[PDB]
Amino acid sequence: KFEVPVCTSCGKEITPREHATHFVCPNCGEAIIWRCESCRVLSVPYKCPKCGWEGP
Amino acid sequence: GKKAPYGEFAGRKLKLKRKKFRWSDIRYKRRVLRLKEKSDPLEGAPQAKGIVLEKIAVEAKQPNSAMRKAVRVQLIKNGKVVTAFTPGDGAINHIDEHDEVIIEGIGGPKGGSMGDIPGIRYKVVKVNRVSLKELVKGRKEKPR
Amino acid sequence: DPKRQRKKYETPSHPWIKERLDRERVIMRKYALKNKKELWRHETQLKEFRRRARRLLAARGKQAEVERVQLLQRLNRLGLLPADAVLDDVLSLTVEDVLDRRLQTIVYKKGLARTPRQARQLIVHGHIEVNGQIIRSPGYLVLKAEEDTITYSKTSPFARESHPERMVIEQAKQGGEA
Amino acid sequence: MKRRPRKWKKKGRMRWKWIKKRIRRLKKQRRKERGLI
Amino acid sequence: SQRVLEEWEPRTKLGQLVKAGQITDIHEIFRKGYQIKEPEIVDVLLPEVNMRENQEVLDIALTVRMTDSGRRIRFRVLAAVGNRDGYVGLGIGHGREVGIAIRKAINYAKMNIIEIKRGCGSWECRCRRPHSIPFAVEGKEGSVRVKLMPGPRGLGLVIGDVGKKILSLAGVQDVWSQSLGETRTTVNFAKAVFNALYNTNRVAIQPGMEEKYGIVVGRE
Amino acid sequence: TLLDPLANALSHITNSERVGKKEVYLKPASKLMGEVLRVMQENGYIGEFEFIDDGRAGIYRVQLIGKINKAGAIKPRFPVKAREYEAWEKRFLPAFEFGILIVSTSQGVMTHKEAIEKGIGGRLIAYVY
Amino acid sequence: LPKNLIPMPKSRFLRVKCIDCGNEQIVFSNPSTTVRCLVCGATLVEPTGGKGILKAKVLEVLE
RNA sequence: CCGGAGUGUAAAAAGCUCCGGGAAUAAGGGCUGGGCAAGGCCGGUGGCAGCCGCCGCGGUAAUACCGGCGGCCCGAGUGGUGGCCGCUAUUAUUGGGCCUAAAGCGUCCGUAGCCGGGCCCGUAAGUCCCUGGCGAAAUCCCACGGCUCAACCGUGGGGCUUGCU
RNA sequence: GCCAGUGGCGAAGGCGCCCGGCUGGAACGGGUCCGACGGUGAGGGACGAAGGCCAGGGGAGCGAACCGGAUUAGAUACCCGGGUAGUCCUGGCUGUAAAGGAUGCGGGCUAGGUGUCGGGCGAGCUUCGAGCUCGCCCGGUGCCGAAGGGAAGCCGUUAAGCCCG
Ligand SMILES: [Mg+2]
Ligand SMILES: [Mg+2]
Ligand SMILES: [Mg+2]
Ligand SMILES: [Mg+2]
Ligand SMILES: [Mg+2]
Ligand SMILES: [Mg+2]
Ligand SMILES: [Zn+2]
Ligand SMILES: [Zn+2]
Ligand SMILES: [Zn+2]
């Protein structure tokens, strides 16, 4: 099977047609930040799991 | 707010309020006070027997144009006059005066009137112990 | 306030669903049924099996274990499930399996009748034996152990191999899906 | 009186103030012919 | 599918990838924020959606606009498509003629394709195989409030005809429903069912529940 | 006025989980709130909880992990024998062993699962799924 | 964590000495009464709606 | 089905076993515009007659009345009337609503009632567990047996009785 | 009267010239006291706009009824001229209103932004003013607004959202 991605903030299993986004950690690389729609629209800060760069 | 009594020891007042507003339920009220039985000339029956007093005709509401045939009928169990509609095409001719006739409900939503006939609640079914459907379709001629 | 014997068949919630009608029309022609009543009877048999199985999934021991065992051994005995079976398999079962366990159908099989309609007539006119016993009810559900003992009656002309219709039926020795 | 804003509307109605006044005149006549005449 | 693939030139980044042989699975399509503006993408990666069966027209309404010079009628068409595993989409289309409206509705449906979770979560099957949904779920649109419950195997779809169609296209064979509101509003009923099937994804789980409920996110 | 700190705590958790908060604070702490959180931790719905102490009833700091859909109090604290949990599950949870009903028993505050495997009933006070 | 967790006072107790006797005396910054020196009867803080106005603290401390 | 013999029966009849004759002796009721399965058919009437559970059809081309042909549903039954449950989350504990749709007392005060902050100790009334005695039989579920199977009956297991103790 | 405001006080009704006296309630500040004393409230009570009534006073303006002049096909009205009750005071009764935020009260949670009233704090400026400006806290009162909610309009930390009554 395939894996379902998970937000780095909410940990809540991104859905198919969610206005989500994914991008590598700045200041770390080597880590895919996933970010759900709720988190984006509510300015929920994230934090890279490898590094600790916080970000919006 | 959150509804009335939700407490663990509030069943009394809860029961009470449900009863209070069941009385706002009109079906329950009719059933429990027996209003139909008090105002029904058929006295809680599905059918009734009556004597035809006269043959009449009734105009359909507004958009439809027709003279629905009917009869004023005196019911025997109470001596009460009700008007009954004679389904079929020559039914009013197959029916005569002083004839014994059986009286069903016409259908209709609340045991009431049906269709473009404004104020008629009853059907004729039998005429001198013979079905009006058969009289109308020709079979089973009338005794009297 | 007494017993009042109740029907053992359930009628459908709506009488005029095109899907159900088509499906049932096909089944009734395939299995040569006189009545939707008969079909619904077997459907209701199945439904009751299923409901018991459901309850016993969502049940607890010392009883509801007895009934689990009883359900499974009943269905084994009827030939609807194998002996290594489970409630999951109950829920997998079908009305077609039930109708296949009818006598009419087994006689259309066992190469005895050439047609389910002729099987019906044989049963009803008294030419089929099950374990030596004449049965005239085509809806009789045969047990998996009685199945191999089905035969023409001894007091049946069809038991004489010289009989014309017997000769035709054995001119077409066929079975399988019925 | 108990009243009804529904009745206060005018889509297919007469004005409720005046319906009310009519009702009260009737009631007065009835009260009048009941108790003393 | 090779057939549409030949005729098709992509016009989108996603379509370029699909044509290029990249993103070969609809699961790779979805959970990425991507923008699907191409039923050709969906037909390529999910060819069974091109089929008249696996397509379902659920409602046709003649809607009116008034003008000086009288009435101008439009046709709203609610259609659904799906692979009878776990993919389904729902679309509305408008036209001056029913056929235009239908083809448009089906295109928008393929664009509104979603991916659902299937399983077994009823107290009285526990079969660990994806005939139902794995947990009760709720959806809404308008006044309609659809609550889908997992059912046992062989139950069927205990729901109105619209839900029957959509859930069949999504691969759900067995379900119980409780509904509120005006289900005689087909659009909002359908969208409520659809949104419930998406809320299957919105719901969270623990590690072993996948195995015990038989959870399946697309094909099995 | 204030009634059931437990319900308030659970509703707070629920709303904070909806908005994706990582930590909540539950202000009128109780031994019962603590037991319920002990259970929720053990069944893996929250992360880490610690009792902060003021001069008042005390606070709980509660670190969440995104594994709650609905957490709530069964407020008519319903007596439940050891063979009715099926029904209360069907009322409060979406699938057959999905979430957790928290039960107060004579042998402590437990889940309905542990209560079943102990053959003991009690009073339902909360659900979490 | 900030500004409502463990609501803490903004007021302070503070040590002052009168100008007349010079006795160090603890007081409250937000008094409800005119505070008088225990020895001289001198007003050390005059009350207000909030933070009292301080007389006679030229050598001061706050705890 | 017809006739006959045995058994059956308190006697008889039915049933059962057998003989003989012969596909003979045996299918309707409702519907047919949509709800709702089934007619771009025909003839008649022509806002009349009539149908119509509701929507609605009918005023000269009527798939909606009457009839013929056809077809659909059920079928030894099928329709009509009344009643109860369901539909109805239109009585809402589960599980409804109260700005504008029915609906927040004009506002406040307070009696009963209901709801009630946190810790410790106790009691053990509710609550939970286990166990004793009861809650008739029939009825309900299941299996197994006997009437050809079944229904029915019996054996056994379980449940039911609001429970009380 | 102007000042006079999405201003303030009040349970609501409602409350505007100034001065003095009596008096109610709230906010803020508070390492003050008491120590759950709380919420809601069936029934019950109190307050309660205008109008009306009883009695007694007063009566400028306005003014139901009424009286006249016009208008109009008519005009039991709208317009004009007058005018009784009434509007004011005292003491009582009445106890109704689109008495409306058409939104019962309490408590907890769920982004905020921008005003404004009051108190407080901290800074800066000052004509050194019970002054001005900025920020922060509390409490009020408004607009906007993401998420969210809803049939929608619209609501949206002053919820019509989630929860506890
Ligand atoms: Mg019809
Ligand atoms: Mg009603
Ligand atoms: Mg309602
Ligand atoms: Mg209203
Ligand atoms: Mg018994
Ligand atoms: Mg707005
Ligand atoms: Zn997130
Ligand atoms: Zn990084
Ligand atoms: Zn001094």
Range of the domain at B113: 1-144
Strands E144-150 vs E157-158: parallel, antiparallel or unpaired: unpaired
Q: How many CA atoms lie within 13 A of C14 on its CB side?
A: 8
Please tell me the distance from the alpha carbon of residue E109 to that of residue D31, in angstroms, as a whole number.
72
Query: Which chain I nucleotides are covered by protein, judged by CB under 7 A?
Result: 27-31, 36, 38-39, 96-98, 100, 102, 104-111, 119-122, 137, 146-147, 150-152, 161-165
Q: How many CA atoms lie within 13 A of D10 on its CB side?
A: 5
Whether B3 has its CB under 8 Å from any CB of chain F: the answer is no
How far CA B36 is from CA of B24, B25, B43, B111, B112, in Å, comes to 17, 15, 8, 10, 12
Please tell me the distance from the alpha carbon of residue B20 to that of residue F89, in angstroms, as a whole number.
32
What is chain D's length? 37
Q: Which pair of structure tokens corresponds to residue B55?
A: 């043959």
Structural domain includes residue C61: yes
Residue E166 phi, psi dihedral angles, 5° rounding: -65, -45
Helix (H) or strand (E) holding F116: helix F112-118
SS3 of chain E: the string is CHHHHHHCCCCCHHHHHHHCCCCCCHHHHHCCCCCCCCHHHHHHHCHHHHCCCCEEEEEEEEEEEEECCEEEEEEEEEEEEEECCCEEEEEEEEECCHHHHHHHHHHHHHHCCEECCEECCCCCCCCCCCCECCCCEEEEECCEEEEEEECCCCCCEECCHHHHHHHHHHCCCCEEEEEECCCCCHHHHHHHHHHHHHHHHHCCCCCCHHHHHCCECCCC
Residue F25 phi, psi dihedral angles, 5° rounding: -125, 125
Please tell me the distance from the alpha carbon of residue C91 to that of residue E172, in angstroms, as a whole number.
16
Please tell me the distance from the alpha carbon of residue A43 to that of residue A55, in angstroms, as a whole number.
10
Sheet (strand G53-54) strand order = G35-36, G43-46, G53-54
Residue type, F43: N
What distance lies between CA E39 and its chain's CA centroid? Answer: 14
Query: Using N-to-C axis directions, what is the helix angle for C36-57 and C18-31, rounded to 10°?
Result: 110
Please tell me the distance from the alpha carbon of residue B69 to that of residue B129, in angstroms, as a whole number.
20
Report the b/e string of E52-80 with b at 16+ CB within 10 A.
Answer: eebbbebbeeeeeeeeeeeeeeebbbbbb
Which residues have CB atoms below 5 A from the ion given as ligand 8? A 25, 28, 31, 48, 50-51
What counts of helices (H) and strands (E) characterise chain G?
0, 6
The dihedral region occupied by G18, where left means phi > 0, alpha psi between -120 and 50, and beta the remainder, is beta
Q: C120: helix, coil or strand?
A: helix
Query: Using N-to-C axis directions, what is the helix angle for E186-202 and E161-170, rounded to 10°?
Result: 40
Query: Quick one: which of B106, B44, B38, B3 has its CA closest to B29?
Result: B38
**Is A22 in contact with A52 (CB distance < 8 Å)?**
no
CA of residue C2 to ligand 5 center, whole Å: 14
Domain at F69-129: CATH code: 3.30.1490.10
Residue type, E204: A
Tell me whether residue G36 is annotated as binding.
no
β-strand partners of B55: B71
SS3 of chain B: the string is CCCCCCCCCCHHHHHHHHHHHHCCCHHHHHHHHCHHHHHCCCCCCCCCEEEEEEEEEEECCCCCCCEEEEEEEEECCCCEEEEEECCCCCHHHHCCCCCEEEEEECCCCCCCCCCCCCCCCEEEEEECCCEHHHHHCCCCCCCC
Touch between chain F and chain G: 3 or more Cβ pairs under 8 Å: yes
Sheet (strand F46-52) strand order = F23-26, F59-64, F46-52
- Going F83 to F84 to F87 to F88, the CA torsion angle's sign is negative
What is the number of domains present in chain B? Answer: 1
The distance (Å) linking the CA of B7 with the C1' of H99 is 29
C-beta atoms surrounding C159 within 10 Å = 14
Tell me whether residue G37 is annotated as binding.
yes
**Is E114 in contact with E169 (CB distance < 8 Å)?**
no
Query: Quick one: which of E2, E1, E26, E23 has its CA closest to E13?
Result: E23
Residue type, C89: D
Query: Quick one: which of E82, E87, E41 has its CA closest to E58?
Result: E82
Strands B122-127 vs B80-85: parallel, antiparallel or unpaired: parallel
Please tell me the distance from the alpha carbon of residue C33 to that of residue C36, in angstroms, as a whole number.
8
Residue type, A26: P
CA of residue G55 to ligand 9 center, whole Å: 10
C-beta atoms surrounding B65 within 10 Å = 9
| Residue whose entry in the numeric block shows the structure tokens 């014309």 | C164
Q: Say what the alpha-carbon torsion angle E82, E88, E90, E95 is, to the nearest 10 degrees.
A: -20
Tell me whether residue G18 is annotated as binding.
yes
Q: Which pair of structure tokens corresponds to residue E116?
A: 């659902």
Residues of chain F positioned with their CB less than 8 A from the CB of E137: 94
Residues of chain F positioned with their CB less than 8 A from the CB of A36: 20
**CATH number for domain G1-63, candidates 1.10.8.10, 2.20.25.100, 3.30.360.10, 2.60.40.1120:** 2.20.25.100
Residue type, A36: C
CA of residue E90 to ligand 7 center, whole Å: 27
Q: Strands, DSSP E only, in chain C?
A: 128-130, 133-134, 150-152
User: Rounded to a whole number, what is the distance in angstroms from the first to the last CA of chain D?
Assistant: 26
Q: What is the DSSP string of A4-51?
A: PP--SSS-----TT---EEEEPTTT-S-EEEE-HHHHHTT-----SSS
Instruction: Give the chain E residue nearest A36 (alpha carbons).
Output: E33
| Residue whose entry in the numeric block shows the structure tokens 């007065």 | D28
Q: Which residues contact G4 (CB under 8 A, 6 or more apart)?
A: none
Please tell me the distance from the alpha carbon of residue C49 to that of residue C71, in angstroms, as a whole number.
8
**Is B36 in contact with B15 (CB distance < 8 Å)?**
no
For chain C, the C-alpha Rg in angstroms (whole number) is: 19
Report the b/e string of D1-37 with b at 16+ CB within 10 A.
Answer: eeeeeeeeeeeeeeebeeeeeeeeeeeeeeeeeeeee
Residue G48 per-residue DSSP state: -
Please tell me the distance from the alpha carbon of residue G32 to that of residue G48, in angstroms, as a whole number.
8
**Is E129 in contact with E212 (CB distance < 8 Å)?**
no
CA of residue G37 to ligand 9 center, whole Å: 5
How far CA C149 is from CA of C152, C172, E193, F59, in Å, comes to 10, 21, 53, 79
β-strand partners of A22: A34
Residues of chain F positioned with their CB less than 8 A from the CB of B6: 75-76
**Is E144 in contact with E185 (CB distance < 8 Å)?**
yes
The distance (Å) linking the CA of F87 with the C1' of I164 is 24
Ligand found nearest the CA of B27: 2
β-strand partners of B101: B50, B127
Range of the domain at C83: 15-178
The nt closest to G51 (CA vs C1′) is: I29
CB pairs under 8 A between C and F: 3
Considering the segment(s) F1-68 as one domain, its CATH architecture is 2-Layer Sandwich (3.30)
CB pairs under 8 A between A and F: 19
Residue G55 per-residue DSSP state: P
CA of residue F64 to ligand 8 center, whole Å: 22
How close does chain E come to C44, measured CA to CA in Å? Answer: 13
Residues of chain F positioned with their CB less than 8 A from the CB of E135: 94-95, 98
| Residue whose entry in the numeric block shows the structure tokens 């062993």 | F97
Residue G21 per-residue DSSP state: S
Tell me whether residue G21 is annotated as binding.
yes
Q: What is the DSSP string of C132-169?
A: TEE---TTPBPPTTTGGGEEE-TT-GGGSTT-HHHHHH
Residues of chain C positioned with their CB less than 8 A from the CB of F86: 58
Please tell me the distance from the alpha carbon of residue E161 to that of residue E177, in angstroms, as a whole number.
12
How close does chain A come to E50, measured CA to CA in Å? Answer: 21
Domain boundaries, chain F: 1-68, 69-129
What are the CB-based long-range contacts (under 8 Å, 24+) for B80-85? B80/B41, B81/B53, B82/B41, B82/B50, B82/B121, B82/B122, B83/B56, B83/B58, B83/B119, B83/B120, B83/B122, B84/B50, B84/B120, B84/B122, B84/B123, B84/B124, B85/B58, B85/B117, B85/B120, B85/B122, B85/B123, B85/B124
The dihedral region occupied by G6, where left means phi > 0, alpha psi between -120 and 50, and beta the remainder, is left
For chain F, the C-alpha Rg in angstroms (whole number) is: 14
Instruction: Give the chain C residue nearest F83 (alpha carbons).
Output: C60
Sheet (strand G61-62) strand order = G24-28, G13-17, G61-62
